[PDB]
């Protein structure tokens, strides 16, 4: 679990969105595993606007933060699950690092702010859904 709170938006994994998230839907994209819903309180997370390839992510299955080098956002094959058939997920960045399914939502951050959230993993790899291109999150 885990979300990004910026301004009047809440950003979560689309496969983990609640009824409230869908009833207050702003934008969703199955191909990116992202859903953004509206909120009444103001969020103070800063979204990074950069091309950083190093950062730190929170791993709930270990109650620890880990530093990682990660790839540039791209289309990566993701195996079938109870939420999606086997497909290419776009805007996905991989790193070598521990992750388990319940780790989705954990934030990835660089010196500039929030980069994205855990969305995929397996075999010593962890994948993060990028949010740095969603410029509208700030206005
Ligand atoms: C962080 O998740 C994992 C880590 C290790 N083994 C497994 C996982 C789980 C995983 O990869 N998923 C399941 C839920 C939907 C995901 C998606 N974006 O399509 C894919
Ligand atoms: Zn950065």
UniProtKB/Swiss-Prot annotation:
Superkingdom in the source lineage: Viruses
Active site: 15, 33, 104
Catalytic activity: Selective cleavage of Tyr-|-Gly bond in the picornavirus polyprotein
Binding residue positions for Zn(2+) 1: 50, 52, 110, 112
Protein function: Cysteine protease that cleaves viral polyprotein and specific host proteins. It is responsible for the autocatalytic cleavage between the P1 and P2 regions, which is the first cleavage occurring in the polyprotein. Also cleaves the host translation initiation factor EIF4G1, in order to shut down the capped cellular mRNA translation. Inhibits the host nucleus-cytoplasm protein and RNA trafficking by cleaving host members of the nuclear pores. Counteracts stress granule formation probably by antagonizing its assembly or promoting its dissassembly.
Assembly, per entry: Homodimer.
Protein's UniProt name: Protease 2A
Protein species of origin: Coxsackievirus A16 (strain G-10)
């Amino acid at each position: 679990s885990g979300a990004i709170y910026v301004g009047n938006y809440r950003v979560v994994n689309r496969h983990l969105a609640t009824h409230n998230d869908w009833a207050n839907l702003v934008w969703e994209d199955s191909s990116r595993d992202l859903l953004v819903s509206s909120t009444t309180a103001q969020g103070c997370d800063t979204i990074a606007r950069c091309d950083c390839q190093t950062g730190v992510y929170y791993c709930s299955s270990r109650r620890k933060h880990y530093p990682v080098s990660f790839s540039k956002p791209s289309l990566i094959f993701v195996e079938a699950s109870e939420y999606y058939p086997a497909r290419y997920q776009s805007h996905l960045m991989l790193a070598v690092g521990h992750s388990e399914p319940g780790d989705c939502g954990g934030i990835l951050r660089c010196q500039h702010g929030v980069v994205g959230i855990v969305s995929t993993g397996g075999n010593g790899l962890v994948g993060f859904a990028d949010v740095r291109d969603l410029l509208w999150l700030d206005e």
